Amino acid sequence: VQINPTPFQQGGLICAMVPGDQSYGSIASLTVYPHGLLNCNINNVVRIKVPFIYTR
Amino acid sequence: EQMIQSVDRTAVTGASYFTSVDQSSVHTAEVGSHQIEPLKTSVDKPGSKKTQ
Amino acid sequence: EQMIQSVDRTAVTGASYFTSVDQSSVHTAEVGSHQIEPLKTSVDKPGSKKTQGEKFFLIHSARWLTTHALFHEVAKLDVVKLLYNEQFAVQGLLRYHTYARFGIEIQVQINPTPFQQGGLICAMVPGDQSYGSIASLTVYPHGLLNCNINNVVRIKVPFIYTRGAYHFKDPQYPVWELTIRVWSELNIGTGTSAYTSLNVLARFTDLELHGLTPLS
Amino acid sequence: DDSGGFSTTVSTEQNVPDPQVGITTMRMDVSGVQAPVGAITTIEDPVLAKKVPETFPELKPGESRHTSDHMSIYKFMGRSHFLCTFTFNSNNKEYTFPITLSSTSNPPHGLPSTLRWFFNLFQLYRGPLDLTIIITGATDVDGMAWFTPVGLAVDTPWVEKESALQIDYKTALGAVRFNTRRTGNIQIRLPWYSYLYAVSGALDGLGDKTDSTFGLVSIQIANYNHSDEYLSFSCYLSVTEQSEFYFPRAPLNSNAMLST
Amino acid sequence: MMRNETRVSTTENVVNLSNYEDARAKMSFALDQEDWKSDPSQGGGIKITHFTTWTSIPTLAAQFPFNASDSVGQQIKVIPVDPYFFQMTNTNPDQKCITALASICQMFCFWRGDLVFDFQVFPTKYHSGRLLFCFVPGNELIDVTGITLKQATTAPCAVMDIAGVQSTLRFRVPWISDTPYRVNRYTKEAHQKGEYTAIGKLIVYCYNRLTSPSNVAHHVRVNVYLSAINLECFAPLYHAMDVTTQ
Amino acid sequence: MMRNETRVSTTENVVNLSNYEDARAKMSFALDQEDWKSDPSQGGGIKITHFTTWTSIPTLAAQFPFNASDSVGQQIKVIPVDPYFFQMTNTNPDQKCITALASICQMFCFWRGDLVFDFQVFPTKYHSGRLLFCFVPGNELIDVTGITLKQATTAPCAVMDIAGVQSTLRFRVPWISDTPYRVNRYTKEAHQKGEYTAIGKLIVYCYNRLTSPSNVAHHVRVNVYLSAINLECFAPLYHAMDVTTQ
Amino acid sequence: MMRNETRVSTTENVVNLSNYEDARAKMSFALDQEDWKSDPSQGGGIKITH
Question: CATH for E1-246?
Answer without folding.
Answer: 2.60.120.20
